Design a protein around this ligand. Structure first.
Ligand SMILES: [Cl-]
Ligand SMILES: [Mg+2]
Ligand SMILES: [Mg+2]
Ligand SMILES: [Mg+2]
Lengths: 206, 208
């Protein structure tokens, strides 16, 4: 289907652990973690500390299996700005117990996502500037130039472990200033000169 | 438009697996859609493991968008079933557990969820009265009865659905009985549900 609405039909979401200040740590979100603009961030009932993580997402334009770094950028279709919503308290316990990160990282609406930005609009994804506000006040700022692992290497690396389909996305890590959000909070985020997006923290209607 | 559940592995977006469910709440982790290996495709061995285990599991293919459903309604959201193998780099898993890292390299690599033909819901009135088996070069290594599952199926559905909305075509593997063990290049795994379905897989290294 069309990359401009890739969150509607894309199957997989792969997320790098730390990529800002030896190999990347990888974890997954289900497709239902996607919350496109106009849809709320949903707070799980089991957390009392949900954090925002501002991240550049790389959307795969064709099927990508064990590709070398230099070819990796041919498999990219575009990009989207994401929040890797994280139940931080659950994560701390998972690290402690050797448990999978699912409840901390992989719940419904745990990946809010901007409009699709075609790769023609971004000649270099390592020269972008990211930002995020909670209730109008600046909280996360990062430059993608300060990423530890480059996007070509991240694509190559995960493609050698997990084949990526067209429409799959890779979240490439968060810069500094990660912190909490509560019910009714509003998160505004963007890439300077390219895209912006608004989201509202909300409880489920169960 | 709509694709058949008989080919759910072709279009299904998500795989959710339960940890220990045989002899307080389930452990959950995920595989990517590209973990699927339908019959005819090889179990691929990741180059970084020296201890790839099999795990015989009943899968549960969802038939209807399933968002935070109660246990008593859960079975209405099921489309059918498939027998799967939760292929696991156990050596990588131990290290993941130790460092408190994600289980991805252990449980979510390519071809790490071999899958049988789809069994419609009508053919299985009670999914807890099934018998599963698995052979490795002819030797019976896994034997389970789904009645001895700790968490029932309707609960597992009601539970994961509260955390993760499940689509049409998504599957939940409901854990593996005893008899888990390793495999190696050129081994031929066969496994089935008694009277319902059977499958065969060759273990290979990738043509990377
Ligand atoms: Cl995990
Ligand atoms: Mg998926
Ligand atoms: Mg992150
Ligand atoms: Mg398992």
């Amino acid at each position: 289907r069309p990359l401009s609405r890739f969150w509607e039909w894309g199957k997989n979401i792969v997320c790098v652990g730390r990529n800002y200040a030896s190999e990347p740590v990888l974890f997954l979100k289900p497709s239902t973690a996607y919350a496109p603009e106009g849809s709320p961030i949903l707070m799980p009932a089991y957390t009392r500390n949900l954090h925002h993580e501002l991240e550049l997402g790389v959307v795969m334009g064709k099927r990508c299996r064990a590709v070398p770094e230099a070819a990796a950028m041919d498999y990219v279709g575009g990009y989207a700005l994401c929040l890797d919503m994280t139940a931080r308290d659950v994560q701390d316990e998972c690290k402690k117990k050797g448990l999978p990160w699912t409840l901390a990282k992989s719940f419904t609406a745990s990946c809010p996502v901007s409009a699709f930005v075609p790769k023609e609009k971004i000649p270099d994804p390592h020269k972008l500037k990211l930002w995020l506000k909670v209730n109008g006040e600046l909280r996360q700022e990062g430059e993608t130039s300060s990423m530890i692992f480059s996007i070509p290497y991240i694509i190559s690396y995960v493609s050698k472990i997990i084949t990526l389909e067209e429409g799959d996305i890779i979240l490439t890590g968060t810069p500094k200033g990660v912190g909490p959000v509560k019910e009714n909070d509003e998160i505004e985020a963007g890439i300077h000169g390219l895209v912006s997006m608004t989201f509202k923290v909300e409880k489920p209607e169960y």
